């Protein structure tokens, strides 16, 4: 598994080199913003259930076919599987966010996922949408939390978004 430092190290090694002063300071900056990062990961963990629930309510509000017989979130067994997948993806997105690298998300979650869903008959476009809704709400929480020091978290909100967007793209 990689994190943002480990990634630097692998690229340096492929040159046969000690880390460039370029790469050093990029990593010094990651340490600089790490308290914000911890709050951002904490924002997701602290509202995981609601993020999934709210995404869910809204997914089925839009796509009332999934909860009809014939639909891929019917009966209870399938809805529980769908709720479970929403949690799994939100979980690996939070891991990537602590790590500063998408690899755990791509390697443990996204790799093969689309082909799984197609084999199952699970409508990937609906799954992509559920991921887009989790993103909206998750970032909502990253931006408006309990008595965190005021500052600018937009860099981290972007990065979190790209992890949500990776997952969506990979699946649709």
């Amino acid at each position: 598994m990689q994190d943002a430092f480990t990634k630097a190290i692998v690229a340096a090694d492929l040159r046969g080199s000690f880390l460039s002063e370029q790469e050093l300071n990029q990593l010094t900056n990651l340490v600089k913003e790490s308290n914000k990062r911890l709050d951002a990961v904490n924002a997701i963990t602290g509202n995981a259930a609601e993020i999934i629930s709210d995404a869910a309510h809204k997914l089925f509000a839009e796509q009332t076919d999934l909860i009809r017989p014939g639909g891929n979130a019917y009966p209870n067994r399938r809805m529980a599987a769908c709720l479970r997948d929403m949690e799994i993806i939100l979980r690996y997105v939070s891991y990537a966010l602590l790590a500063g690298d998408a690899s755990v998300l791509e390697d443990r979650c996204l790799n093969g996922l689309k082909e799984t869903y197609v084999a199952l008959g699970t409508p990937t476009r609906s799954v992509a949408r559920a991921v887009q809704l989790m993103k909206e709400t998750a970032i909502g929480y990253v931006n408006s939390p309990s008595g965190v020091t005021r500052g600018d978290c937009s860099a981290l909100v972007n990065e979190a978004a790209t992890y949500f967007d990776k997952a969506a793209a990979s699946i649709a």
Partner: protein, 274 residues
Amino acid sequence: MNVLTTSSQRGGKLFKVTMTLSPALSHHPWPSLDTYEPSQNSYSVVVPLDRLLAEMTYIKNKGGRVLDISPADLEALGPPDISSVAIPLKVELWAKADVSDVQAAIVAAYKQIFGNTYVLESERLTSAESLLRNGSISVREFVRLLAKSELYKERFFFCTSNNRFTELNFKHFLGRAPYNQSEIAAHLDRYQTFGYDAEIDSYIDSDEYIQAFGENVVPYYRGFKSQSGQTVESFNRMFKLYRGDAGSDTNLNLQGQKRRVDPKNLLRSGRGIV
């Protein structure tokens, strides 16, 4: 074990393996004789890199045969995107060509006929292109000229079996996969008694070819769309045949020019005689 998700746990490179097992690995717990499930005749399992050497050794011992090893992450990105080629762009050469109208045709015939391999500039058929430019020959005529050339003979024929050659031929010349086992056989017997050249003519003078391409149209893909007198399983063969925009026919593969359409698969569409 089948089609996978993810790659690694601690970290790995997962490889998925495929074998053919004896009742030595897997048997039912029944009263007699040891048998594995008939549908797991060739079974596949995804193993992270360290357990991999140990697994292959075990499988080989207790009797199985490894059929393949391929990284899991290669195999997770699906099947090809086919949007560029579901419905292509036709290129056709007009009566009084415009000087670069004809430039369009040559680049495309090359790409399509040679199956997206690079044809380097030393390599191109210049005298033949001269002919098309002056109108002495037509686009179908030119298309036949490339096929009988050494460059075509060399990257696609000389180094692979006849099964493969014919399967490539259908893809290049006709744009569609080969529908039947009979098609393969009918062709192999022709090459054997009339030679390579007669056999090449047989796709370019065919009724199927003539309808779709006529004579001034560069052969273009057409097997991702329903056709006539096409078995239904020839639309899955097309995925096996074309691997994406960046894929190509390539004889430079490490393993060499090989198949792509399983012989077992062809028989599913019907078996007769001759």
